[PDB]
Ligand binder design. Structure first.
Ligand SMILES: [Cl-]
Ligand SMILES: [Cl-]
Ligand SMILES: [Cl-]
Ligand SMILES: [Cl-]
Ligand SMILES: [Cl-]
Ligand SMILES: [Cl-]
Ligand SMILES: [Cl-]
Ligand SMILES: [Cl-]
Ligand SMILES: [Cl-]
Ligand SMILES: [Mg+2]
Lengths: 374, 435
């Protein structure tokens, strides 16, 4: 998620949003909190041990460090039996004031429910979860990982995220495509204008979690620049610029391996090359540039003198596909769009668009090609 | 002379000049808003001018049974108000303002209009009047329109209907009277002729400072008690008792060791830690001096030992053994202590982070009596919505926060014939209340 918005830390000057990143000045604080996470300690013990740190230091930062450090811990497996039934049937024995009668109540309740009750009686409650493996993080890295999480937390409110290209642009779109992002490429300066989670009204949650995976690659580059437009307020909305370039104090620690999978573009390639022989299928064709808008198709297919381009689109909105196709009227070719019905709110229908559910139904692409080959 | 004094559409009119009256060309009289009635009548009487007045066309006072028995701070408030019969009574929430008011109503025996700010306070006042006065009152507000010798009405409809009702009720009771200086309502107050006014509030002061208008619109404050005052030894209705315990031998070792570390540091830098400005200095230095941080850590850690000493659990066992038959709630500040106490005695625990489903289950299984005892934390949870307990046992705390005192006043005001608050404190440890 990044961080809860209650812990977001930023200031607005004029029309710009400046994030309050952690710096070396926060190393002391980071070390003293890192020392508090030791194996065999309860999270609620740590909540009480930091209390004085919330008097000395910025408590939005103190809380973020703890919520990040807990995210790197291993806790015990959940209890066999839901712990609230452990306490209803243990606390029904009133207050026990004799030590011997207590042990017997315990064993009586442990035989009825078949578990070690004391080990699990409060296991469903954050305050009582005991740490088994402590995180390995360094003070520098936590600061680094805080800052990347704060950046992500703020980009979740972005209407638009303009990414400017140094080196690996062809490597960026790949990930953006494998993540299904919504974007427009341009060329005045070569840049990608990703639409941000404020575009979506529906599945922002799932969109943002992938946009953030794209940051990881961007900021690994030698030269990068992003300008986000952020939207704040419910009924009077104003837009703010977040401008950020070549900031080296970022680091991801979310592995998030196996989230951006090219299941759909690859299967389609197999199915089309096998079932269609009349067309030649070129993959990752050179992008086209029409009056300084870049169009990066997924496939070019040709039969003799007919040439048509295929783009697959992961997320979408009514206003996005309308904009994409409007801009595609000026590309001077036939172009076939393949939309995912699950990643939309409106179940779209167009003269050049084929929806797909979990894979592309090659039946329909074959059908589509001849119904205008004539 | 023979001055005529007559009510008219929210004004008082007069043959003759009285201070605060001003001549009306439109009306051909000396006039002012009807609320000046009491004062100009008294101006004329005290100068032996015969006052022929048709001002108050009062509803008949209804038939009542007085079922009210007052605590004694409640009656001094009645005695205060009665001297001038124009004033505000400031009592905290739950100190029973309503019953002081209804007692006044029964003493005065004049038609009474009670002005409240919300629809829930209509139905509430309606209920209290049935119980404590045995009269189903008139209600104007929410869409109901009945008018009787005693009537409950919204501020909005009192303002709307002021010229019609301004002369019908001699007694005028403004609940939540801090609303009265607001823009619409202040002219409502001035349109009534009602010579007798009682305002009730726990929050007399306003951020716009318009409580300066009270003497004009309702009367000044004539009686005020804080919850702190009303939680005195001799005034409250529950006993407050401190039972003292000693630290463990190991606790005393650690506690004293921490105190020495802290004291030596402070002395090594010419710092002190006597008041809360001293604290701010130490916190300030702790941002950038490691040794100051560890000192402030010693302070916290030693305080934690004293507050959460295992000897308090041992004492708690003795208390729960002495009161096998009473309904006990144990309070802590820390959540971790609440879990120690729940594990040690197998009693339900409630913290601020308990799911609202279970939290509702626990307190109800408590009020029904399946749970004779529970423990609860108070950091980040108001002692609010809690049922009646005969016995409160407070383990730790940086004193008692005002709401806490207020909250516990409500849980034990219900409690019984006389209930008891026990606080467990440790003996040798230093006083940590910093001024
Ligand atoms: Cl329970
Ligand atoms: Cl917007
Ligand atoms: Cl494109
Ligand atoms: Cl007249
Ligand atoms: Cl008078
Ligand atoms: Cl209204
Ligand atoms: Cl009391
Ligand atoms: Cl709980
Ligand atoms: Cl001691
Ligand atoms: Mg009241």
């Amino acid at each position: 998620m990044g961080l809860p918005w209650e812990l977001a830390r930023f200031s607005i000057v004029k029309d710009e949003v400046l994030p309050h990143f952690a710096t070396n000045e926060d190393l002391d604080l980071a070390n003293e909190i890192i020392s508090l996470f030791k194996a065999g300690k309860k999270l609620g013990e740590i909540d009480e041990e930091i209390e004085y740190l919330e008097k000395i230091y910025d408590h939005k930062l103190v809380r973020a460090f703890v919520k990040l450090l807990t995210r790197l811990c291993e806790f015990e497996l959940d209890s066999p039996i839901p712990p609230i039934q452990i306490r209803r049937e243990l606390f029904k024995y009133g207050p026990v004031l004799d030590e011997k009668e207590r042990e017997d109540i315990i064993q009586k309740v442990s035989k009825k429910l078949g578990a070690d009750i004391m080990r699990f009686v409060f296991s469903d409650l954050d305050e009582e979860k005991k740490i088994i493996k402590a995180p390995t993080i360094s003070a520098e890295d936590l600061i680094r990982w805080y800052n990347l999480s704060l950046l992500q937390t703020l980009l979740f409110k972005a209407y638009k995220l303009t990414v400017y290209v140094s080196s690996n642009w062809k490597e960026i779109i790949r990930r953006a495509k494998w993540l299904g992002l919504m974007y427009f490429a341009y060329d005045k300066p070569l840049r990608f204008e990703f639409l941000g989670p404020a575009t979506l009204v529906k599945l922002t949650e799932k969109y943002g979690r992938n946009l953030a995976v794209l940051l990881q690659f961007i900021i690994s580059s030698q030269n990068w620049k992003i300008e986000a437009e952020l939207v704040l307020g419910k009924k009077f909305k104003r837009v703010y610029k977040l401008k950020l370039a070549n900031f080296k104090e970022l680091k991801e620690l979310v592995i998030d391996e196996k989230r951006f999978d090219s299941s759909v573009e690859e299967k389609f390639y197999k199915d089309f090359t096998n079932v269609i022989k009349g067309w030649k299928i070129i993959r990752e064709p050179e992008p086209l540039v029409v009056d300084n808008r870049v169009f990066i198709p997924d496939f070019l297919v040709e039969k003799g003198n007919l040439k048509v381009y295929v783009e697959i689109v992961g997320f979408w909105t009514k206003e996005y596909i309308k904009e994409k196709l409007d801009k595609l009227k000026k590309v001077k070719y036939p172009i076939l769009i393949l939309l995912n019905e699950e990643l939309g709110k409106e179940k779209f229908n167009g003269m050049n668009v084929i929806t797909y559910k979990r894979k592309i139904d090659i039946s329909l692409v074959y059908k589509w090609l001849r119904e205008l080959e004539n | 002379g023979s001055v005529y004094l007559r009510y008219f559409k929210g004004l008082i009119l007069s043959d003759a000049y009285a201070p605060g009256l001003k001549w009306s060309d439109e009306l051909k009289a000396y006039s002012a808003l009807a609320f000046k009635y009491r004062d100009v009548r008294k101006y004329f009487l005290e100068k032996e001018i015969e006052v022929e007045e048709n001002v108050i066309d009062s509803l008949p006072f209804p038939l009542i049974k007085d079922k009210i028995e007052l605590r004694d701070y409640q009656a001094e408030a009645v005695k205060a108000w009665l001297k001038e019969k124009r004033g505000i009574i400031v009592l905290p929430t739950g100190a029973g303002k309503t019953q002081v008011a209804l007692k006044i109503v029964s003493i005065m025996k004049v038609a009474t209009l009670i002005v409240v700010p919300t629809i829930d306070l209509i139905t509430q006042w309606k209920e209290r009047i049935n119980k404590y006065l045995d009269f189903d009152p008139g209600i104007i507000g929410g869409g109901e329109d009945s008018l009787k010798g005693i009537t409950v009405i919204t501020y909005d409809s009192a303002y709307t209907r002021a010229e019609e009702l301004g002369n019908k009720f001699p007694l005028l009771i403004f609940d939540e009277v801090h609303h009265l200086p607001s823009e619409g309502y202040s002219i409502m107050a001035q349109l009534f002729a009602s010579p007798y006014r009682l305002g009730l509030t726990a929050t007399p002061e306003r951020d716009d400072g318009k409580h300066e208008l009270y003497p004009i619109l309702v009367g000044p404050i004539v009686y005020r008690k804080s919850v702190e005052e009303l939680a005195g030894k001799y005034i409250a209705k529950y006993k407050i008792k401190k039972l003292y315990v000693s630290l463990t031998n190991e606790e005393k070792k650690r506690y004293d060791g921490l105190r020495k570390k802290l004291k030596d540091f402070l002395s090594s830098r010419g710092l002190k830690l006597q008041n809360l400005d001293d604290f701010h200095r130490l916190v300030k230095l702790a941002a950038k001096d490691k040794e100051a941080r560890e000192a402030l850590l010693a302070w916290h850690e030693s305080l934690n030992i004293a507050v959460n000493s295992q000897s308090k659990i041992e004492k708690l066992r003795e208390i729960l053994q002495e009161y096998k038959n009473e309904k006990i709630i144990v309070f802590t500040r820390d959540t971790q202590m609440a879990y120690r106490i729940s594990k040690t005695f197998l009693i339900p625990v409630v913290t601020y982070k308990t799911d609202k489903d279970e939290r509702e289950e626990i307190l109800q299984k408590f009020r029904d009596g399946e749970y004779r005892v529970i423990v609860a934390s108070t950091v980040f949870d108001e002692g609010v919505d809690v049922p009646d307990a005969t016995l409160a046992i407070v383990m730790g705390g940086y004193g008692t926060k005002r709401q806490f005192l207020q909250r516990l006043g409500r849980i034990l005001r219900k409690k019984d014939k006389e209930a008891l608050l026990i606080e467990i404190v440790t003996k040798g440890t230093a006083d940590y209340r910093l001024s």
